[PDB]
Every structure is written in C-alpha cells, then in structure tokens.
Amino acid sequence: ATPSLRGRLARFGNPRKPVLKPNKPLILANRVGERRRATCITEMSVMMACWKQNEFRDDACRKEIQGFLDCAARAQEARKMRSIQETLLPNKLNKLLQRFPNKPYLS
Amino acid sequence: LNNIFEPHVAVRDAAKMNIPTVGIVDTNCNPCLITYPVPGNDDSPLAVHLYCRLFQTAITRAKEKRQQVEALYRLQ
Amino acid sequence: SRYSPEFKDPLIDKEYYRKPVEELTEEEKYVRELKKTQLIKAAPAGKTSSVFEDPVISKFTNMMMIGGNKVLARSLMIQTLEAVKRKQFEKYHAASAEEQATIERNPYTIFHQALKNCEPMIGLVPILKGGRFYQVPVPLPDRRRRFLAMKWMITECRDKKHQRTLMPEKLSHKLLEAFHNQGPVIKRKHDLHKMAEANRALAHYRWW
C-alpha cells in the first residue's frame, strides 16, 4: 500500500507544515531508469599458496593449476551465456509505458 | 480517441477546417468540438457493428433516394 | 579487406573432407551443404595439407620473422630444429641404454613441450577501480598464454647477451633448457608468477 500523499505536501488548505518536500514533482514519468551495471579467486588463492609453498614449481601443483585454468574457462563461459541471456528489459518496459503513458494534464 | 486515450487530432483539424463531424463519443471522450456527438459505447464489437451498419444503410438510402429523385426530375 | 564479408576462411583437412557421409550428424551435413553454396577465400601461402605441416612452428617462424624475410626466418627455424635433433641424437648415443628410454629425440615434441612449460598460467593486467589502475593478477586465455611463451622465447634468443652465437644454436639451447624446465625463459615465467602472487592482495580489484 503506497504511502499516503493526503496532506503531505505544502499546499493551500493544508494546515500542517509540509511532511515531504519532493525536489521533483511526484508524477510518474513515461520511462524507467536504464539498467545499472572479481570471479573465481578461491581457486587462484589455492594455486598461489601451493606455488608459494612449492617454489612455484608447476610440477608439484598440477591439480591446482588445472583447476584454476578450468575455473577461468568456466568464468568466460558464464560471461558469454549471461550476456546472451541478458540481451523485463528497460526498452520493452518503456515501450509498454509509451503505449499507456501518464496524463498529468487534462485532455 | 486515438490509441493513447487522447482526442483524435482529426477532430481539432476538422473543426479548424469547418468540416462537420459526426462522432460516437464514449464516456471518456470530449464532445466539445464534435458537431454531432452520439453518446454511446464505441468499444464493444456489437455497438461498433451497429454503428457501421446504421451509417452504411443511411448513406446507401440517401444515395439511392438521390438517384431516384434525379430520375424523377429529369424524366418530366 | 579485399575479401567481402560473404567470404569464409578455407578449411584444409583431407581427413575432414574424406570423413564418411554416414558419420555426419544432421548439423554437420547441414554445414557441408551450406559451404557448398558459400564463397571461400584463397588458400593462404603459409599453410598446406602437408602431413608435416605444424601450425605452432609456422606461428613461431612468423613471430621470428623480421621485415618479411620468410625465407630467412624459415631457414633459422629449420636450423634450430636440426640442431636440437642433432644434440638429442648425440646425447642418446653417448648415453646408457637405461636413460636412452627417457632421452627424447623428436624435435617437434621437444619444441611443443618447451613452449607448454614456458606458458605463463596467470598474468598481470591493469584494472582500474575508482580511477586508479593497479596490476591485478588475472587468468589468461590460451591464445595469450601461447603467445607470451613464444614471445619470451624469441626475445630471450634475440637478447645481446649471447654474442657471436648463431640463432639456431641459441634457440636450440634455450629450447632444450625449457624442455628440461630450466633457463632464463622459465625463470621469467616464475618471476611473473611470483609477482602475481605478491600482488594477490589486489585480486578483488578485478570485476570480470
């Protein structure tokens, strides 16, 4: 239940002092804001600790290195799949709102 | 009303151009500038069909009466 | 690019073109049928269906090239391979039958393994958070890893420390060192890994 606006704004016929002082008018706009914008560091830390304790000899850290590499590959795959899937959208939402726009005036 | 629930600009333009306007106005329409409003339901298929049939029949009747009267006058 | 977008890169594999039609999945048959009606670029002068063709060595020769002297670069590459093979044969013959089992004489295998050893797993990339770039450790793609291995090898060879030493010998010696997991190239890879581990504290500065 949206908060009431009865008697909240400084208006004539409103005895009490204003409750809200909206910087912008409280009128629904016909658009929505544009969607607003490290990975796999555990495996990296494991591999780097193994390197530190083994003098970075990859010979004795093969499992950790392979896990790190596969994790990076999966991170790339996740980025790609996420991008394609992301491609409701603000564009669609704005189109719908345009179809049914706000009317803050009299026709 | 246009497709955004505003008065059709043709109403205002026709009023500007002095073209008489008949028009079905629903309860949310503005009959201020329509020459001949016909307050009624324009959103129901049955109502719209009825209006189309009425106007079509009246126009056809008028044209056929015009033809008959022209023949009557020119044959005497 | 004189080639219009319609043009597709040619595929050079006798095995692929001789694959039985029955072995082809629906999508593979569709791909073949589509290529039947597609424009294809001319076969580049760098690759052929030769069974001895090695893309890795081709790329290494290209990286070693200087000013379009493909002839000289290829000559240096073949000299390096011959020198490596001769060194391995000398060691094999001079070595006991027991260790001759381990001594390897395939120059192509030696080269591939040396490069794979030299490949750096994790790199340092500048990442900017809040307006300040920092050298964050980061995973690398296989392409970048292979390229870095090759570039380090070639730069190490080109260094002036080895004076009056011909490139074939320089590169053969360094390749053997890398194969046995020693030498300046491997040292450089370990130094990169050590720097990355030291800067491990900044990993979260990455966002991707």
Added chain:
Amino acid sequence: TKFSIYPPIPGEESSLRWAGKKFEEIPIAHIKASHNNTQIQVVSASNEPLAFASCGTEGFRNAKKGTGIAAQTAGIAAAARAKQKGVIHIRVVVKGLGPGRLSAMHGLIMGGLEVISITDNTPIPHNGCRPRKARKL
C-alpha cells in the same frame, strides 16, 4: 525433527550436539572487523582466551590490513592456533562491518575449524554517543 536456523535455548532440553558438547559449551570466536583492521580471539565457553590473530600481527601494515586477504590470513592463523589448542567447532560472533567481516570467517574455516553458528554483535547505539562529524573531501 527439522532444521531450525535459530540457536538452541539454554536450559531447554535439545538434541543438538557438537563433539559431544552442548551449544553453550562450544568455544566462541569473537571477530572484530574494524574499518582498517580485523582482530580475532577464540575464547573458551568460560571466556578463557585460546588464540589471537590480527591483520597487524600477521605482518600487514597500514592500508593492507583492511583487505579481505589480510582478514583471511589472520583467520587462518587464529584457526591454526585454536586447532593446536584443541578447538574443533566454534560459535562465531563478529562485531563490525569492516572489510574483513566475511574473509575472516573464510580464513578461520580454511584453518580447519568448523563454524556451527554466526552471530552479529555489531554495537548499534540506540542514539547514545554522538559520532564524529561528516567528512567533506
């Protein structure tokens, strides 16, 4: 029975146990995640200090203390000390939204110790003292 995220009530007859102990008797790992330092102290169920570890004591100095990596390091050190003092399962109480809040727990676990509960005891005055003034940069 079914799993409940709430802790068992002292004085109530509950079935849960850890290392043959009741919930009240599990040692407590007080984490303190200040803005630029993460301290950890593992006390017994009778507030007997067992292990200590802080970003500063781990060697980090200046800004480096306020990093999740430093928190993990301190947590691992504290977990090792507690493990050699004979601590398996711990109740974690962390008071502070410092950067080490969760990385300290991760380090503590990577040190071997198991966590049975997580408690937030961040001091939140009910409008008590007046904090220092804002920062204009």
Added chain:
RNA sequence: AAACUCAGUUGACACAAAAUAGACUACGAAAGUGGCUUUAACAUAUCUGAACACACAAUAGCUAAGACCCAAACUGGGAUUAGAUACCCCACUAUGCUUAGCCCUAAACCUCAACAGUUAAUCAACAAAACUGCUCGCCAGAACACUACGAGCCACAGCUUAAAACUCAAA
C-alpha cells in the same frame, strides 16, 4: 604521516543521547516535540486586532555554580600544497548538558497573513490551480543600507527602528 601501547573477552558502572515503531503525520501560537511512569495540562459559543504593550522565541553567545561519555569552534601536531591561516588524520579547550539570570537573532521559509466562501466564467513565466468578501501589517527603481545619526534595551565588537548625500540607467 603523526598519535597511543595499549588491544580482545567477560563483569561492574552516567547529571551524556534517546535504534526499530515512523511506509505513522499527531501535539503546540511559533520556536519546537519521536525512551518509560506519574502529577498538572493543552485560552475564546464571533471574526480581525500591536513600532502601541504584555508573554514566548531553535542554534549561537555572556554571567555564576556543577557534570563531562562523546562531539567540538579556537589552539597544537601530522600530512597535502607553489603557498594551505582550508579541505584529510590525531589530541584538547570554550561549547553542546543541569541550575539561576541574561541575550531576543535565524533561509525563525510551507519565502504562500487571519477569518468566511466558490469552483464559475482559468491563467504573464515558473512555483504549490484560479478567485471572491472583510480585516490588519507591509511595499513604491538599484545601491549607499541587517548603514550613520537619534532613540530604546541587564544588551558594550550587540540587538530593534533606520535615513540622507554623492552615483547609474538600469537593478
């Protein structure tokens, strides 16, 4: 960097400030009032009515005595800087608190006076739609000017009222 060797757990403990409730919009004339309990208590069966008196008036500030956790003008130190009398960090004081007086100023602004009424033929612009009746206060180019003088005031670098001369064609 400077600063302290004070730091953590547990327990005891304020004359400081009153999370969530509050997405509530109430109380008061305004300033203001958001922990709890109790006592007293929130004027006018008609509306306006103070530079003409009475009583109030946040924060800051003075006077005298206490409290002092934290915060903090000034001050000192550490940085940053061409400089840094600032911004950033640390310490600490007046001060914020309680008591008794003073002080009587705020963008004290909802910049929209009180009362009664209308939504009809709108309305420079923006803002919080336009008006009617009645009353009080106020305004008459800009700046000089929250000024000088005079006057009043527990005010002594103050507050209230407040001009004029020169100047301009603008503000």
Added chain:
RNA sequence: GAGGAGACAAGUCGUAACAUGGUAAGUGUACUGGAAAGUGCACUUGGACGAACC
C-alpha cells in the same frame, strides 16, 4: 586628521561564487585568517542523490 560609500579605473595575491564552481550554496551566531574566506552548532533548498526490481 582619519574612516565609510560611490565612481573612475589598469595593476598585486589568491580563486571565494556561478557547473556537484572542483569542500554544494546560504541564514544566525562564535573563534580564527593577507584576502576573498575557514571551521563549530542549528536551520533553508533558492542543490543533487540518476527516481520498478536490481
């Protein structure tokens, strides 16, 4: 004599204001400072916080 205002009018030291004027601006008040001004407490928007969820 010295102050104050205005005007005329090119300089000197800064960049305080107008943009988030680069520390948002300002009112009252107090201390401080070549100088605009800085800071402390409360107040105003004659600033914003990007206005579905993220």
